[PDB]
């Protein structure tokens, strides 16, 4: 591009730069690790000296970004620095860093503070073996596209079925008579209850089954709208606590029908699906081994 | 004649006719429910109890 | 009444499917039976819950008749539809709705 | 000085016992509700 | 010496695997008066055959390279216990090094040392993919330390051990969410730390949704890769009356004989129904006692099983164990069913393949159990209240506070309790590690081994947070690596007994047939036929379907939700009749998708008229409007192709799923017999929802255990301490005698069996499909040969065989890969 009037830094660019910026980003990772998160605006001594250290780590990466940006075009000039694959990531990193660091000393919140955990990704840039390893997974997840478009649609179908069948059913429970305390037993978790139905009537002596109960898992597991129904369907599909949802529906509406909904979702959603991905990926491994066996 | 005069479709169309007759009688035979408050035994149906 | 109407409309297609090589006609007929069956079941529902809103209760004779007619019609329509629908291809060339 | 370290936490207690052992006082730990009664009536032992 | 040197290592193993808690003193005496002598006997074997192999050949083979390490560590450790090296943790972390000598029987087997010749290179080559997993874990722990760090400060008294308060704890939490165990409770704590089930809070679920899926995926991939490559190395380097009447009538009567075992009542001894099946038993027995002579009056290994079955059905017409021996009644169907015995024997020949990888795993399990006994033996005791740290202090009563309210307390007697899964011997250690390797209850063993204080004292919160390493290596070796090379073993072995593309296409271009299109005459009805198959029309149909789907999601809890239902019902029933008129009810019912559409339309009509009949005066008829977006699978040809491809091979192998249903049947009957009288009390794991009283309930319990739920808690809900059901029969005062300690043999076996057969069904269905999965989608294939079929049936509305010559101009419409 422009003449060699600005490239006063391309002389030490080819020095062993990797064996110093790697140790710097590793020390940055360590200073990120030993940080202690304290509740409600509290801090200690070591947490104060680790924010003065984010000025030594944000000033090295930034001057190296300058050294690499002006050594190749104004910004790109041929899509050189910015459009280099693993040089845009580092730019966003050191461009959010300074941004939020000067923002923290302009109102003198913590949302952009959490973008500080992307700096550990720089180590992948540091070693090219990791760079080629990381690009193989995004190369092998394209055959898993017709499986994801099937899992998404199955989750959306079962969410709507559960929204039609169970919406607003797990809202009664048995409190103590005249109280707002749920009445349970030693290891029992608060489950739904039924009055005038095939559901469960609860047994504790001074207890009555009335409504106004936010739901089973503090109000998180229920088919009350599309978002929560999607959430509980997805949770069941991972085969984690699906029997709890089944049992709560059994307590709410009745024992004989609801299993059809959950044994079908666990067979189709979990076993059939994981069997699909265990075949599609092993087939991809086999074909990428066979194409290389001819080399 | 593959699906229409095979034996495996005729056995099923046989099994259908049993359901046909038992259903056309079930609408008319009120012999499926009793109630006894407690001698006033009842017999429910679809049209008249 | 709707269930018996479905049985009526299904027997027609079940019989007209025997002539003129109208085998395709056995595909809708089956389905009608299914709904008939299904209808019978929800019929059950109503009566059942009525029995538990009126004392003792007990189903003696015709509940078996209905619980048999429903399951037979339902399973038979489903299996008739499975037998009229040709086959899952099972081969890279075979296909559903293939020429004879 | 009587110092009390309350709760089940991961913080350093050395300085608190030092404040206790230096100024003629005592150091108590209250991890739960069941310890409150007996640990809050025991300073009368030191005062005596 | 080839066997005398294995005799000494076996004598040493049987002595290091006999150290338990509270062992007799003579046992402690034996265990070291048999260690110094055996260490010196390991010393003579590093001298005489050292001198036999000269000078420099005791460093050429890595085999005897670490054997000098054994002697160095042994003597150095002998002289460090006569020193101030106390702190039993320190004295025992060398007795774990003492275990490093068992590798002398692994020293001696060919195939047990041949497999590691590339298994060790597996990690070494993949060390840059395992590192990406480590970096993923570290980034997600550093993100969890920001989102939920110091935010689990709920005022209640309930302990939440899996938090993100510091970096080791965040690592433990992220690893536990990765293994999948109890991740939903971590998510619930994360949701309650924020607002709650509201708009700000619930978005913190995304974190977990990204941590599980994209975290499982990567991991899985890595392991799979490793497995396949390491297995290739171990597979390529080594490479270089007698009619149908009788049989079909007896076969349909063994199923009745079996289902008479299903329908039963274990609680009611002779229930009103039970003697009906007792009478049917004589019928099902005497129809079989005749056909044992119609088979061996014509004649004099598989029918002796049947004769024993009928003999035990005759002698029955303590001894009550014989009633468990009548569960092989369906095991005789492997006689007549010929396709059944083929897979029953293909499974017994597939077990011989996996016998090499089971012994190395069992040995790793044993050695990790020994390390566990050296670490956490005696340390899994506790008191009811966690303020008393000794069995002598844990006496009397204490108060418990409900909901953590200091003004609402109850009295509870305090008792010195032992954990249910502990590390006192190698049997208990192996059981604990077995429950850990299935990922169930492993955080409760972790946070209990972290609090381990001393040999007979109670826990201390966050005492030893480094103990987590013991639980994170074992999980990575056994549950992530050995289990994955087991699956790689079975998949690569199935791979073989399963050119090719030319063969497939020359078979295609022979047996394929033409396709019918139903292109009609009569331009007056050809008019509506033209607007029926327009891409614009079907795209309007697809858009209407997605509009109905988005209208189905708008419903919530606490009327324009039914008028639109009727409006869509009308749109679809008019589309159906218009398609019918354009196809004359002959081309319409030819397409299965049109059969499904007709099904949906009839169901929707019935639903709307039922709802307005109900408002003029069925919860499942409302499901037919949801089934509509299934016909959205008539457009996505890749998804439809994948679904058909897998459903084909799932239908091709029903005799491998028959094995699973037989396993479930047998185990459910045996469990109804063994533990079927236990009470149904809430707060326990045998309750109204999960029990053994009836056959459906037992089958659903076994399905829950198959899915790997808290099966190790049902295993403890049936162990000779359980209150009997009041309806049962038992002597007074003799109540807590239900349940048997046979549960450990019942569950541990079942899981294993249920994990084998399932894996089997996963591999067959995969290898039967290895054509479509290992296919280059560009070079060649049947998709082009279906392109040809389509463009050919275009010119040929009715099949009528083949077609005219010119319309030869079609060859200009083909892709160059084929045209
Ligand atoms: C994406 C490709 C395919 C993905 C999905 C493929 C299939 C789609 C999912 C299948 C639907 C699951 C079955 C519905 C769940 C029923 C639960 C239930 O009935 O309880 C609630 C309700 C309980 O509600 P309720 O009526 O008691 O509540 C109020 C009480 N009253 C009204 C009395 C005041 O049960 C019913 O309404 C009756 C249902 C009985 C009949 C339904 C069972 C048959 C359903 C279809 C069978 C097909 C099986 C699966 C197909 C194969 C797919 C793998
Ligand atoms: C390489 C693999 C990559 C890994 C993939 C990662 C998946 C990303 C997850 C995406 C999640 C999207 C969430 C965005 C929802 C928008 C937020 C919102 O407004 O909805 C709130 C919702 C309902 O409203 P709410 O606030 O609860 O109601 C209170 C009264 N107003 O309240 C809620 O509860 C919203 C929560 C919805 C969460 C649904 C989760 C189900 C989706 C998982 C299925 C995907 C399976 C992937 C399989 C692919 C295989 C490789
Ligand atoms: C794709 C990959 C994997 C594929 C591999 C194939 C293996 C599949 C294995 C999965 C089996 C899951 C079985 C789940 C069915 C359980 C039924 C159930 O839980 O219903 C409970 C309900 C309770 O009623 P009850 O016990 O009478 O008491 C209440 C009375 N007021 O009971 C009822 O009200 C109705 C009871 C009738 C239900 C019968 C239908 C199923 C029952 C058993 C089916 C299987 C039979 C043999 C076991 C084979 C299963 C493998
Ligand atoms: C009951 C009614 C029938 C169920 C839906 C009918 C749709 C159908 O089964 O069509 C066949 C479909 C693909 O078959 P085809 O295109 O012929 O594949 C040959 C390519 N070598 O094969 C498939 O169905 C693929 C799997 C989709 C099944 C959808 C389930 C719909 C029924 C619920
Ligand atoms: C086998 C000989 C190695 C035994 C080493 C050992 O005792 O393991 C200790 C470790 C838990 O660490 P810990 O002992 O608590 O740390 C002491 C700091 N106070 O727990 C462990 O790491 C035990 C497992 C370490 C290696 C066992 C098998 C390794 C096989 C491939 C790796
Ligand atoms: C990677 C980069 C992702 C980092 C994004 C995290 C920062 C965005 C959320 C900012 C935040 O933490 O809080 C904002 C807001 C207020 O929350 P706060 O004030 O802490 O407490 C309640 C008081 N309103 O929050 C709320 O009021 C409700 C909670 C907001 C939902 C938080 C969003 C979590 C989603 C994280 C997904 C991470 C997955 C990607 C992982 C990246 C891997 C490199
Ligand atoms: C078999 C599996 C083996 C398990 C390997 C786990 C490795 C241990 C991780 C480091 C560790 O355990 O401690 C982190 C420590 C900072 O935390 P610390 O000071 O211990 O906090 C005290 C809390 N009261 O010390 C650290 O901060 C080290 C954390 C390193 C994070 C950055 C690493 C950058 C690249 C990652 C690869 C190394
Ligand atoms: C590559 C594969 C993976 C790719 C990743 C994709 C990730 C997507 C998964 C995340 C989706 C979860 C969305 C969660 C939010 C749902 C809406 C919601 O949160 O609230 C429910 C809302 C009403 O709730 P409420 O707040 O009570 O309203 C009034 C309150 N007084 O009611 C609503 O308004 C919600 C209505 C939405 C209904 C939609 C149902 C289906 C629509 C999609 C079908 C089209 C398929 C996409 C086509 C793509 C083809 C390639
Ligand atoms: C190199 C050496 C050569 C040796 C090779 C021998 C190979 C044998 C491999 C078998 C697998 C063993 C792994 C199981 C872990 C051990 C379980 C155990 O020992 O349990 C201990 C239990 C008592 O423990 P505790 O908690 O103290 O309670 C006592 C109160 N009664 O006491 C018990 O009652 C437990 C009873 C154990 C029952 C085991 C049943 C296993 C049957 C599985 C067969 C199917 C496997 C094939 C499929 C594999 C595919 C994955
Ligand atoms: C016997 O080995 C074992 O102790 C096993 C442990 C400890 N855990 C579990 C879950 C097993 N299992 O049967 O699924 C086997 C295991 C585990 C990893 C690889 C192979 C096997 C094998 F045993 F099945 F071979
Ligand atoms: Ca689990």
Provide DSSP, E352-421. Answer: TTTTHHHHHHHHHHHHHHHHHHHHHSS--EEESSTT--STTTS-SEEEEEGGG-TTSEEEEE--EEE-SS
Probe ligand 6: pick from A93, A100, A111, max atoms within 8 Å of CB? Answer: A111
Q: How many CB atoms lie within 10 A of CB E216?
A: 17
CATH number, position E77: 1.10.287.70
What is the sign, positive or negative, of the torsion defined by CA atoms of E524, E529, E530, E531?
positive
Query: Are the CB atoms for E660 and E639 separated by under 8 Å?
Result: no
Compute the distance between CA of residue C81 and CA of residue E624 in angstroms, rounded to an integer. 18
Looking at the structure, tell me whether residues E84 and E43 fall in a common domain. Answer: yes
Beta-ladder partners of E418: E381
Query: Quick one: chain E helix, strand, coil %, rounded to 5?
Result: 65, 0, 35
In terms of phi and psi (left: phi > 0; alpha: psi -120 to 50; beta: otherwise), the region of E120 is: alpha
Residues in chain E: 819
Torsion of CA E796, E798, E801, E807, to 10 degrees: -20
Query: Are the CB atoms for E178 and E213 separated by under 8 Å?
Result: no
Query: Are the CB atoms for C13 and E598 separated by under 8 Å?
Result: no
Query: Are the CB atoms for E725 and E678 separated by under 8 Å?
Result: yes
Compute the distance between CA of residue B46 and CA of residue B29 in angstroms, rounded to an integer. 8
Query: Are the CB atoms for B6 and C23 separated by under 8 Å?
Result: no
Q: Which one, of E176, E704, E754, lies nearest residue A239 by Cα?
A: E704
Class of residue B14 by CB neighbours under 10 A (exposed 0-12, middle 13-18, buried 19+)? exposed
Looking at the structure, tell me whether residues E56 and E124 fall in a common domain. Answer: no
Helix (H, G, I), strand (E, B) or coil at E680: coil
CA–chain centroid gap for E570, Å, is 46
Report the alpha-carbon angle E94-E100-E103, nearest 5: 170
Residues 6+ apart with CB under 8 A from E141: E164, E167, E170, E171, E173, E174
- Quote the domain boundaries for residue E160: 112-240
Probe ligand 4: pick from C89, C93, C98, C99, max atoms within 8 Å of CB? Answer: C89
Compute the distance between CA of residue E261 and CA of residue E676 in angstroms, rounded to an integer. 14
Looking at the structure, tell me whether residues E216 and E120 fall in a common domain. Answer: yes
Compute the distance between CA of residue A174 and CA of residue A185 in angstroms, rounded to an integer. 12
Class of residue E37 by CB neighbours under 10 A (exposed 0-12, middle 13-18, buried 19+)? exposed
Task: List, comma-separated, the residues after which chain E is broken, a break being a C to N distance over 2.5 A; otherwise answer none.
Answer: 240, 300, 317, 498, 558, 617, 807
Compute the distance between CA of residue E390 and CA of residue E409 in angstroms, rounded to an integer. 24
Class of residue A101 by CB neighbours under 10 A (exposed 0-12, middle 13-18, buried 19+)? middle
Compute the distance between CA of residue A246 and CA of residue A250 in angstroms, rounded to an integer. 6
Residues 6+ apart with CB under 8 A from D22: D1
Helix (H, G, I), strand (E, B) or coil at D28: strand
Q: What is the DSSP string of E404-424?
A: G-TTSEEEEE--EEE-SS--S
Beta-ladder partners of D6: D30
| Element holding E8 (H helix, E strand) | helix E4-16
Query: Are the CB atoms for E813 and E783 separated by under 8 Å?
Result: no
Looking at the structure, tell me whether residues E117 and E206 fall in a common domain. Answer: yes
How far apart are the CA of E762 and the nearest CA of chain A, in angstroms?
6
DSSP state of E723: P
Compute the distance between CA of residue A113 and CA of residue A96 in angstroms, rounded to an integer. 9
**Contact residues, chain A, for E620 at CB < 8 Å:** 165
What is the sign, positive or negative, of the torsion defined by CA atoms of E155, E157, E162, E167?
positive
Compute the distance between CA of residue E610 and CA of residue C35 in angstroms, rounded to an integer. 13
How many helices, marked H, and strands, marked E, lie in chain B?
1, 1
Compute the distance between CA of residue E421 and CA of residue E424 in angstroms, rounded to an integer. 9
Compute the distance between CA of residue D22 and CA of residue E714 in angstroms, rounded to an integer. 55
Helix (H, G, I), strand (E, B) or coil at A210: strand
Residues in chain D: 48
In terms of phi and psi (left: phi > 0; alpha: psi -120 to 50; beta: otherwise), the region of E54 is: left
Are the Cβ atoms of E150 and A181 closer than 8 angstroms? Answer: no
Query: Are the CB atoms for A206 and A174 separated by under 8 Å?
Result: no
Looking at the structure, tell me whether residues E61 and E136 fall in a common domain. Answer: no
Class of residue A274 by CB neighbours under 10 A (exposed 0-12, middle 13-18, buried 19+)? middle
Compute the distance between CA of residue A284 and CA of residue A273 in angstroms, rounded to an integer. 17
Q: Distance from the CA of C34 to the center of ligand 1, in angstroms? A: 16
Give the start-end residues of each E strand in C41-88.
56-58
Looking at the structure, tell me whether residues E224 and E142 fall in a common domain. Answer: yes
Looking at the structure, tell me whether residues E167 and E211 fall in a common domain. Answer: yes
Looking at the structure, tell me whether residues E123 and E31 fall in a common domain. Answer: no
Q: Which one, of C26, C30, C23, lies nearest residue C6 by Cα?
A: C30
Pairing of strands E381-383, D26-30: unpaired
Q: Which one, of A263, A265, A257, lies nearest residue A169 by Cα?
A: A257
Q: Which one, of E595, E594, E625, lies nearest residue E607 by Cα?
A: E625
How far apart are the CA of C25 and the nearest CA of chain E, in angstroms?
8
Beta-ladder partners of E678: E724
Pairing of strands E381-383, E416-418: antiparallel
Query: Are the CB atoms for E549 and A159 separated by under 8 Å?
Result: no
CATH number, position E169: 1.20.120.350
Query: Are the CB atoms for E140 and E215 separated by under 8 Å?
Result: yes
Torsion of CA E291, E292, E298, E303, to 10 degrees: 120
Beta-ladder partners of A175: A182, A208
Which of D7, D28, D34, D40 is the best residue to mutate to test the E interface, defined by the most E CB atoms within 10 Å of its own CB?
Answer: D34
Compute the distance between CA of residue E642 and CA of residue E648 in angstroms, rounded to an integer. 10
Are the Cβ atoms of C47 and B44 closer than 8 angstroms? Answer: yes
Q: Distance from the CA of E698 to the center of ligand 3, in angstroms? A: 8
Query: Are the CB atoms for E113 and E107 separated by under 8 Å?
Result: yes
Looking at the structure, tell me whether residues E126 and E231 fall in a common domain. Answer: yes
Q: How many CB atoms lie within 10 A of CB A291?
A: 10
Compute the distance between CA of residue E605 and CA of residue E602 in angstroms, rounded to an integer. 5
Report the alpha-carbon angle E180-E183-E185, nearest 5: 155
Looking at the structure, tell me whether residues E63 and E26 fall in a common domain. Answer: yes
Compute the distance between CA of residue E687 and CA of residue E141 in angstroms, rounded to an integer. 38
Probe ligand 10: pick from E437, E473, E487, E759, max atoms within 8 Å of CB? Answer: E437
Compute the distance between CA of residue E810 and CA of residue E789 in angstroms, rounded to an integer. 12
Compute the distance between CA of residue E556 and CA of residue C41 in angstroms, rounded to an integer. 28
E181 in a labelled binding site: yes
D12 φ, ψ to 5°?
-80, 130
Query: Are the CB atoms for A222 and A252 separated by under 8 Å?
Result: no
Compute the distance between CA of residue E104 and CA of residue E3 in angstroms, rounded to an integer. 11
Q: Which one, of A161, A160, A235, A224, lies nearest residue A192 by Cα?
A: A224
Q: Is E733 on the interface with C (CB under 8 A)?
A: no
How far apart are the CA of E443 and the nearest CA of chain C, in angstroms?
46
Beta-ladder partners of B34: C58
Q: Which one, of D12, E182, E645, E452, lies nearest residue C92 by Cα?
A: E645
- Distances in whole angstroms, Cα of residue A37 to Cα of each of A32, E150, E160: 11, 6, 17
Query: Are the CB atoms for E367 and E465 separated by under 8 Å?
Result: no
Class of residue E426 by CB neighbours under 10 A (exposed 0-12, middle 13-18, buried 19+)? buried
Are the Cβ atoms of C96 and E610 closer than 8 angstroms? Answer: no
What is the sign, positive or negative, of the torsion defined by CA atoms of E168, E174, E179, E180?
positive
Tell me which long-range contacts E276-284 makes (C-beta under 8 A, separation of at least 24).
Answer: E281/E313, E281/E317, E282/E317, E284/E253, E284/E256, E284/E257, E284/E260, E284/E313
- Distances in whole angstroms, Cα of residue E314 to Cα of each of A212, E262, E279, E284, E332: 60, 19, 13, 11, 16
Which of E387, E409, E410 is the best residue to mutate to test the D interface, defined by the most D CB atoms within 10 Å of its own CB?
Answer: E387
Compute the distance between CA of residue E670 and CA of residue E672 in angstroms, rounded to an integer. 6
**Contact residues, chain E, for A141 at CB < 8 Å:** 217
Cβ–ligand 7 distance for A7 under 6 Å, the answer no
Looking at the structure, tell me whether residues E178 and E70 fall in a common domain. Answer: no
Query: Are the CB atoms for E350 and E356 separated by under 8 Å?
Result: no
E612 in a labelled binding site: no
Compute the distance between CA of residue E661 and CA of residue E294 in angstroms, rounded to an integer. 30
Residue E401 is nearest to which of D31, D33, D35, comparing CB atoms?
D33
Query: Are the CB atoms for E372 and E99 separated by under 8 Å?
Result: no
D4 φ, ψ to 5°?
-125, 125
Residues 6+ apart with CB under 8 A from B13: C14, C76, C80
Find the helix packing angle between A259-266 and E695-706, rounded to 10°: 30
Beta-ladder partners of B31: none
Q: How many CB atoms lie within 10 A of CB E158?
A: 8
Looking at the structure, tell me whether residues E151 and E216 fall in a common domain. Answer: yes
Q: How many CB atoms lie within 10 A of CB E271?
A: 14
- Distances in whole angstroms, Cα of residue E512 to Cα of each of E148, E504, E811: 61, 12, 19
Helix (H, G, I), strand (E, B) or coil at C86: coil
Q: Which one, of E480, E423, E478, lies nearest residue E452 by Cα?
A: E423
Q: What is the DSSP string of E64-98?
A: TTTHHHHHHHHHHHHHHHTTT--SHHHHHHHHTGG
Q: How many CB atoms lie within 10 A of CB E28?
A: 11
Helix (H, G, I), strand (E, B) or coil at E150: coil
Query: Are the CB atoms for C53 and C99 separated by under 8 Å?
Result: no
């Amino acid at each position: 591009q422009n003449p060699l009037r600005k490239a006063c830094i391309s002389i030490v660019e080819w020095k062993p730069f990797e064996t110093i910026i790697l140790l710097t980003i590793f020390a940055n990772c360590v200073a990120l690790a030993v940080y202690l998160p304290m509740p409600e605006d509290d801090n200690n001594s070591l947490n104060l000296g680790l924010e003065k250290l984010e000025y030594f780590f944000l000033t090295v990466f930034s001057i190296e970004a300058a050294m690499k940006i002006i050594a190749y075009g104004f910004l790109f000039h041929q899509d050189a620095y910015l459009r280099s694959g693993w040089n845009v990531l580092d730019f966003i990193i050191v461009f959010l860093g300074v941004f939020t660091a000067i923002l923290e000393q302009v109102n003198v919140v913590k949302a952009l503070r959490a973008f500080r955990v992307l700096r550990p990704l720089r180590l992948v840039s540091g070693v090219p073996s990791l760079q080629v390893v990381l690009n193989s997974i995004f190369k092998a997840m394209l055959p898993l596209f017709h499986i994801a478009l099937l899992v998404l649609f199955m989750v959306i179908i079962y969410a709507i079925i559960g929204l039609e069948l169970f919406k607003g059913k797990m809202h009664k429970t048995c409190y103590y008579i005249g109280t707002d305390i749920v009445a349970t037993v030693e290891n029992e978790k608060p489950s739904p209850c039924a009055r005038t139905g095939s559901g469960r009537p609860c047994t504790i002596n001074g207890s009555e089954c009335r409504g106004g109960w936010p739901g089973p898992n503090h109000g998180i597991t229920h088919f009350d709208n599309f978002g929560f129904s999607m959430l509980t369907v997805y949770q069941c599909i991972t085969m984690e606590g699906w029997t709890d949802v089944l049992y709560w529906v059994n307590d709410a509406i009745g024992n004989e029908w609801p299993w059809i909904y959950f044994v079908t979702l666990i067979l189709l959603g979990s076993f059939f699906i994981l069997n699909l991905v265990l075949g599609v990926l092993s087939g991809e491994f086999t074909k990428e081994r066979e194409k290389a066996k001819s080399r | 004649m593959s699906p229409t005069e095979a034996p495996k479709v005729r056995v099923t169309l046989f099994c259908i006719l049993v359901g046909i007759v038992l259903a056309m009688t079930a609408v008319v035979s009120d012999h499926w429910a009793v109630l006894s408050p407690h001698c006033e035994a009842a017999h429910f149906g679809l049209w008249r109890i | 009444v709707f269930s018996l109407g479905f049985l009526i409309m299904g027997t027609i297609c079940a019989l007209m499917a025997f002539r003129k090589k109208r085998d395709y006609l056995l595909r809708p007929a089956s389905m009608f039976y299914v709904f008939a069956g299904l209808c019978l079941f929800v019929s059950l529902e109503v009566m059942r819950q009525s029995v538990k809103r009126m004392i003792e209760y007990y189903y003696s004779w015709s509940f078996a008749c209905a619980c048999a007619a429903f399951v037979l019609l339902f399973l038979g329509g489903i299996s008739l539809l499975l037998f009229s629908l040709p086959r899952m291809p099972q081969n890279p060339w075979e296909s559903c709705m293939d020429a004879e | 000085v009587f110092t009390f370290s309350v709760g089940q936490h991961n913080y350093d207690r050395g300085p608190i016992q030092w404040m206790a052992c230096e100024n003629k006082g005592y150091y108590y730990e209250i991890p739960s509700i069941g310890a409150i009664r007996i640990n809050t009536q025991e300073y009368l032992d030191v005062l005596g | 010496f080839y066997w005398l040197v294995i005799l000494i290592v076996a004598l040493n193993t049987l002595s290091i695997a006999s150290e338990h808690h509270n062992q007799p003193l003579w046992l402690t005496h034996l265990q070291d008066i048999a260690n110094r002598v055996l260490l010196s006997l390991f010393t003579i074997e590093m001298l005489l055959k050292m001198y036999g192999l000269g000078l420099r050949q005791y460093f050429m083979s890595i085999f005897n390279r670490f054997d000098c390490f054994v002697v160095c560590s042994g003597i150095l450790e002998l002289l460090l216990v006569e020193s101030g090296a106390m702190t039993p943790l320190g004295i025992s972390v060398l007795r774990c090094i003492r275990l490093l000598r068992l590798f002398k029987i692994t020293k001696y087997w060919t195939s047990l040392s041949n497999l590691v010749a590339s298994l060790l290179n597996s990690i070494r080559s993949i060390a840059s993919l395992l590192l990406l997993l480590f970096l993923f874990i570290i980034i997600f722990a550093l993100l969890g330390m920001q989102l939920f760090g110091g935010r689990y400060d709920f005022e209640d008294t309930e302990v939440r051990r899996s938090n993100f308060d510091n970096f080791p704890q965040a690592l433990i939490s992220v690893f536990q969410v990765l293994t999948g165990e109890d991740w939903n409770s971590v998510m619930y704590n994360g949701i309650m730390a924020y607002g709650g089930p509201s708009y700000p809070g619930v978005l913190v679920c995304i974190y977990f949704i990204i941590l599980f899926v994209c975290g499982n995926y990567i991991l899985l991939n890595v392991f799979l890769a490793i497995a396949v490559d390491n297995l290739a190395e171990a597979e390529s380097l080594t490479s270089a009356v007698n009619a149908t009447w009788f049989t079909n009538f007896i076969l349909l009567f063994i199923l009745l004989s079996s289902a008479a075992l299903a329908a039963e009542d274990p609680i009611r001894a002779e229930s009103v129904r039970n003697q009906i099946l007792g009478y049917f038993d004589i019928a099902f027995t005497s129809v079989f006692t005749v056909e044992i002579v119609l088979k061996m009056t014509t004649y004099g290994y598989f029918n002796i099983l049947d004769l024993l079955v009928v003999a035990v059905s005759l002698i029955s017409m303590v001894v009550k164990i014989l009633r468990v021996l009548r569960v092989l009644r369906p095991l005789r169907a492997i006689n007549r069913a010929k396709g059944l015995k083929h897979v029953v024997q293909c499974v017994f020949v597939a077990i011989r393949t996996i016998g090499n990888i089971v012994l190395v795993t069992t040995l790793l399990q044993f050695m990790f159990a020994c390390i566990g006994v050296q670490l956490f033996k005696g340390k899994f005791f506790s008191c009811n209240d966690l303020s008393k740290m000794t069995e002598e202090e844990c006496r009397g009563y204490y108060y418990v506070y409900k909901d953590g309210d200091p003004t609402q307390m109850e009295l509870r007697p305090r008792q010195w309790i032992h954990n249910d899964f502990h590390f006192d011997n190698v049997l208990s250690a192996m059981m604990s590690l077995f429950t850990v390797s299935t990922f169930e209850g492993w955080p409760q063993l972790l946070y209990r081994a972290i609090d381990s204080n001393e040999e007979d004292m109670g826990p201390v919160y966050n005492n030893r947070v480094e103990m987590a390493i013991f639980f994170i290596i074992y999980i990575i070796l056994i549950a992530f690596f050995m289990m994955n090379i087991f699956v790689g073993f079975v998949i690569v072995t199935f791979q073989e007994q399963g050119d090719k593309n030319q063969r497939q296409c020359v078979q295609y271009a022979l047996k394929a047939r033409p396709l019918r299109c139903y292109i009609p005459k009569n331009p007056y009805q050809y008019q509506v036929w033209y607007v029926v198959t327009s891409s614009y029309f079907e795209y309007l149909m697809f858009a209407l379907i997605m509009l109905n789907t988005i209208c189905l999601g708008m419903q919530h809890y606490h009327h324009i939700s039914d008028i639109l239902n009727v409006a869509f019902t009308i749109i679809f029933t008019l589309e159906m009749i218009l398609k019918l008129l354009a196809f004359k009810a002959r081309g319409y019912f030819g397409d299965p998708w049109n059969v499904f559409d007709f099904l949906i339309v009839i169901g929707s009509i019935i639903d709307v008229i039922l709802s307005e009949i109900d408002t003029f005066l069925s919860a499942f008829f409302r499901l037919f409007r949801v089934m509509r977006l299934i016909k959205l699978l008539s457009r996505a040809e890749g998804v439809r192709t994948l679904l058909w491809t897998f459903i084909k091979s799932f239908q091709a192998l029903p005799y491998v799923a028959l094995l699973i249903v037989m396993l479930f049947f047998i185990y459910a009957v045996i469990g109804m017999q063994m533990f079927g009288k236990i009470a149904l009390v809430d707060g326990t794991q045998i309750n109204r929802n999960n029990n053994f009283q009836t056959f459906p309930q037992a089958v659903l319990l076994l399905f829950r255990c198959a899915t790997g739920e808290a099966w190790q808690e049902i295993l403890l809900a049936c162990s000779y301490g359980k209150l009997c059901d009041p309806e049962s029969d038992y002597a007074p005062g003799e109540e807590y005698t239900c349940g048997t300690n046979f549960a450990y043999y019942y569950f541990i076996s079942f899981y294993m069996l249920c994990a084998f057969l399932i894996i089997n069904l996963f591999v067959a269905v995969i290898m039967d499909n290895f054509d479509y999965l290992t296919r280059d989608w560009s070079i060649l294939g049947p998709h082009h040969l279906d392109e040809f079929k389509a463009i050919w049936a275009e010119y040929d509305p009715e099949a009528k065989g083949r077609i005219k010559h010119l319309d030869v101009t079609l060859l200009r419409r083909i892709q160059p890969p084929l045209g």
